[PDB]
Amino acid sequence: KIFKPEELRQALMPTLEALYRQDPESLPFRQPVDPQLLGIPDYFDIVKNPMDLSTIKRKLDTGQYQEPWQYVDDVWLMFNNAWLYNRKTSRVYKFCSKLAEVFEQEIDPVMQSL
Ligand SMILES: C[C@H]1Nc2c(cccc2C(=O)NCC(F)(F)CN2CCCc3ccccc32)NC1=O
Ligand SMILES: C[C@H]1Nc2c(cccc2C(=O)NCC(F)(F)CN2CCCc3ccccc32)NC1=O
16 A cells, blocks of 8 residues: 555566567667657647656656556656557557557566565
């Protein structure tokens, strides 16, 4: 009912590492979206709450999650952002789907041990 930041961190970091380590599939997700650099300048018109892996890492590192479902919500926000923004035929969309499949596998037994 009260989760200490260092125990969320130690429980959840390996699930975040599972996403990061997927190469090339994590590469679009490792840093905040820079719409001008990426040549997707309308991104913030579509995606109102951006999220990426390095953001989620920083949140886990600084104790910003009071409970583990908040971490799951940020991961899924990142995925929902990609599935909204990109066409279903896009390699970014398909990479997002692969990362969600990996996440589902890794997070389910972790959320159960919590
Ligand atoms: C996964 C394994 N390690 C940790 C685990 C818990 C806490 C920290 C680490 C660790 O390793 N922290 C240093 C770092 F620097 F790795 C940050 N690191 C973590 C993965 C996400 C990521 C992405 C890019 C760069 C670093 C990084 N549990 C473990 O099971
Ligand atoms: C989250 C945001 N990302 C992009 C989106 C559209 C276009 C580009 C990106 C993006 O991030 N580019 C940086 C990259 F590092 F990913 C480059 N590169 C590495 C190898 C693997 C690969 C695969 C597909 C596209 C690029 C890419 N749509 C999005 O929603």
